[PDB]
Ligand binder design. Sequence first.
Ligand SMILES: [Ca+2]
Ligand SMILES: [Ca+2]
Ligand SMILES: [Ca+2]
Ligand SMILES: [Ca+2]
Length: 308
Amino acid sequence: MLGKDVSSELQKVNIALKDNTLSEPGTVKLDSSENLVLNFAFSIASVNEGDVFTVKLSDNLDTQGIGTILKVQDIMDETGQLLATGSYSPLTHNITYTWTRYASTLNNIKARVNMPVWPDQRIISKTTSDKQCFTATLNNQVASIEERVQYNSPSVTEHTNVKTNVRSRIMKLDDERQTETYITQINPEGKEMYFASGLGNLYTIIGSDGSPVNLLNAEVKILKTNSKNLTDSMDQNYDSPEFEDVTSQYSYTNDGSKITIDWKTNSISSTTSYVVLVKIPKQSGVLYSTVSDINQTYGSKYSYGHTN
Ligand SMILES: [Ca+2]
Ligand SMILES: [Ca+2]
Ligand SMILES: [Ca+2]
Ligand SMILES: [Ca+2]
């Protein structure tokens, strides 16, 4: 930036991070659709078209949650006209606002914004026992708040004849493509999984309760890794050396309502975990995943929902 960033000329600047909407202030429950709230305000005597100002967030804070939209809401004046448009950058964790031609015609502009912000699931990708520090800066004013970040734990069954564990999550909603990504972790706990003789192979069934979800066009990818490489948000680099693509090894059936994967064994070792990624058009409905027999009579089941 050589010039034109007007953040240093803003007056009466205020900025704050708040957690009033959390069910239990002190902890953000990312699997209970919780988030923090950012607000800021200022005045500015005049601006030029194309000038910018920047709201800086800490590296562990984003404007997205599970979304993919970079735009943030426009800033409007009292007449309902547009003062500035803005966008979030994954690179810098900054929100950059650009003043409009309309704004450049005014004098004594007031700006005020409220928006949700989330602990970034790619950065704080696992449940934390201790509080994390979240900050935002606008010129010389800074806000901070501390919160633990919590994700749900896996479903586990540990009996003599059946040992299973599983977890799933809708971890991405793509705005442009109108899709959702539903990820299933098989053996996220890194334990022995087992069905005793007479109980058949271990299977993973992916379906919906309500089956309102259409899976006919699902894109399915299956990866193998050690559990120590798995995050709780499931938003991680799946192209890394720690993951092997085994999609071709484990064929599946799909009747449009259920996807059934035969693991081809009654035993999965503690050091073997699988991740099944299912991408489908965005749809309302609660999806579930299992590690079970084909009839979902025994084993484990985890559910995760979404509403348009
Ligand atoms: Ca929510
Ligand atoms: Ca930064
Ligand atoms: Ca820490
Ligand atoms: Ca773990």
